[PDB]
Write a protein that binds this ligand. Structure first.
Ligand SMILES: [Co+2]
Ligand SMILES: [Co+2]
Ligand SMILES: [Co+2]
Ligand SMILES: [Co+2]
Ligand SMILES: [Co+2]
Ligand SMILES: [Co+2]
Ligand SMILES: [Co+2]
Ligand SMILES: [Co+2]
Lengths: 70, 70, 70, 70, 70, 70, 70, 70, 70, 70, 70, 70, 70, 70, 70, 70, 70, 70
């Protein structure tokens, strides 16, 4: 519900990061734009239950590294 | 009950991710569509107890890495 | 009581995952069908205390990997 | 009192798994039949404090792997 | 008080497992007989504080493996 | 107070295990006899704060293995 | 205050183990004599805060092993 | 419900006689050990509805004689 | 209604004895498993009105001796 | 009214035992199916006054032995 | 008034068994059809005081065996 | 008063069976006609104390067999 | 419940006859010692349900004569 | 509990017949002396549950005849 | 308590028949003198529980015939 | 009534020491078994008034030494 | 009740001194183990009324000196 | 109870004198150390009922002189 975070680095211009709400319904809550080279450190909270990443990006989580190729 | 997440990367167009209800009866509660190259970080919550994945995909959990080919 | 999950991947058509009821008496309360290639991440909850797996399947738990040949 | 599970795989037909009752009085409260190849993941709860396994079987616990030759 | 367990496998016929009472008074509270090849997984409970094993047996605990030759 | 245990195996006939009371006063409250080959798994409780072992025995604790020659 | 213990083995006759009182004023609370070969497993409690060991003895703690030669 | 009895003679060492309780649930109630040569005359009562005999024994009932070869 | 018994001796491993309910509707109420060579003396009670026997077995009643081969 | 029983042994697959209701009106209230070799011990009760047997069967009553060829 | 039964076996097709009512007024209250080879065990109750059998049949009672040639 | 019965088989056409009233007054209360070959099983009741049989018939009672040649 | 007796004749010095308690729990209730030649006629009572005989002895019951060779 | 008797004949001078009480405790109630040739017919009562016979005597019970040699 | 009797015939002059008191206390309650040839049919009653016979006499009981030679 | 003791030493296997109760009725209260070589120091109490010794034994009292030969 | 004592000296390893309960019921209430050479001066108390000595030992009482050889 | 004393003289360095508590529960109460040559005159009281002496010592009581060698 908290206390865990992800690290996303943008590898190209125009990377989109979307947060899905917490509750009975699942609706979009917010989105963020990242330009090439930017780093975002995001946390799981009371209003966020899922994080969706579009665009070429490098992601670090507790389970290791992954690369999105959108 | 809460505070654990899975990482799903879509390896093909049209991958389905389904969340099942938490309660006495089990029913489909929400689903998400993923495009090729896209990444979702999903958490276990107060309305979701099980997660099904349809389509070719790459999954990371606390127990390791698996690949689905449905 | 909660907060622990298993990962099941179906290696054949028609794999059955049965949940057993939590309480004084024990009975089947839910069946799940998996087709060849699908992956299910299932959690221990307030209504489930045991899980039975019939069919050829690949299972990951905190204690390691096992293969069912039912 | 809770939150610990065992993994039992039946290596031959007709394996019996018996659960003992929690309290001042200890009585047999349920048993399960396993056919050759099936897998059961079972949890310690408020009504089960001990588990007995009869028949040839393969068991995984937090302390390692054991085999019953019954 | 609870939430720990031992694994006992009987290496000969007629193995006795005795549970001693928890409290100011210390007395035999229950015992179990194990046939050859059987495996018992036993948990420390609110009514059990000590466990005595008579007969030839193989025991797994968090501190390692031991062999009783009673 | 609880949630910790020792494993004692008797290497000779007539091993004595003595449990000391918990509180302002410290007096013997119980003892147990062990024959050659027997194994006792004993827990720390609300009425026991110290344990004494007389006789040739082999002991397993969280800090390792020790042997008493008494 | 609890949940931590020391293991003392007497290597000579007449080993003294002294407990100091828990509170604002510090004084002797109890002591124990150990004969050659005996093993004592002692726990920290609500009435004991420090432990003194006089005589030749072998001590195991969470931080390692030490030998007293007084 | 009463007024009828069985006679069991032990033909070998270690014969077990088990009594099952009377009521809606059927749980074990008591067991007895017989050494080679002993005779037990047991009655049906308010807390006993079935009797189970393990081991080589010679049994006399109103319907005649039988021999268990366990 | 009460006070009559049957004697069943198992002539093979895995013999099932089933007791049916006493009431308006008839349902399975309990079952027992018997090993090769064991004898059960069962009584008619306030919750049991009929008894079914599956497996090779030898039966004694007031009316004589019969053999089942199911 | 009660306290008397019949013994039926099935000599062919699919033997039917029908119970007739006790009271002013008479109707079928229970069917029982027996496979070849099974034995049923059935008692006259507060809801059963007559018993119909269809199929090849061997029947024992207080008056002797009969064989049905239905 | 109760607790006595007759055994009727139908030796040819179309055997009729009629029960007469108990009380000051005697009237036909039920009848049964039996096909060749069928067996019926019937009891005397609070609504049946006499039984009439038409057709070729074989009857067993406490007084012996009789045959109806109807 | 009750709970005894006679068996009458008609050896010729038109056999009359008459039941006489129980009490201070004695009178015909009911009669039955039997065709050739028929069998009637009749019970002594609260309204019947004596039975008269006219016509050729074969009678079985607890005291033996008799033949009426009326 | 009551009203049935056994006859025990001691064929050697020091024969033990043990009576077990009637109720929910079973324990020793009394015992008797018999010298060579003595005869005891013992009745089933409201505080006794089972009887053990240790030693060489000759026993008479309603079901016949048996000998204990303890 | 009542209404059953034994017959004892004295075959030697000085035969002793001892009666034990009926209740929670088994305490001697009375004894009787018999000279050579005497016959005693003794019944089971509300204050008597067991009978011991010392000396050379001849005993008749419902189960047959025995001879005490003491 | 009642409904059983003995038959005593006096084979010599002066035969004594003594009745002992029924209750917690036992004492002589009555006696009868029989001359040679006389016959007495005596019953067990509410005030009598044991009977002694002194003198040469012939006795008939439910268990057979005996001869007293006092 | 109090404060006096006897000393009993067993000179043979199986010596019996019986204590008689203090009151209007002098009856057995307890017995004790002594093996060869044991010594029992027994006092006179409020529930004890007499002591019987059976078997070969050596007794010391205030009045001197005696030897029981039984 | 008090004011008297015994003196026991242990002449061998492992001498047992057992105290029996004072009252209507008699049971083991405490025991002491003596190593070779030790001396125990024991007193009769309000809770102790008899004392047993097992093992080789030397005993002094008001009546003199005795030697136990258990 | 009181008013009796024992004289102990230490014949070697380090002699231990242990006093045992008076009451239903028996447990160590106090100990005393004696060096070579020292003398202790100890009494019996309401908190002491038994006394143990470890080490080489010379003891005087009302019953005489004894020596401990421990
Ligand atoms: Co935008
Ligand atoms: Co969709
Ligand atoms: Co047991
Ligand atoms: Co089953
Ligand atoms: Co005894
Ligand atoms: Co007179
Ligand atoms: Co002990
Ligand atoms: Co000190």
């Amino acid at each position: 519900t908290n206390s865990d975070f992800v690290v996303i680095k943008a590898l190209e211009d125009g990377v989109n990061v979307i947060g899905l709400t917490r509750g009975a319904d699942t609706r979009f809550h917010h989105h963020e734009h990242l330009d090439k080279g930017e780093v975002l450190i995001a946390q799981f909270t009371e209003h966020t239950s899922a994080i969706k990443v579009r665009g070429k990006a490098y992601i670090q989580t507790r389970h290791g590294v992954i690369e999105s190729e959108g």
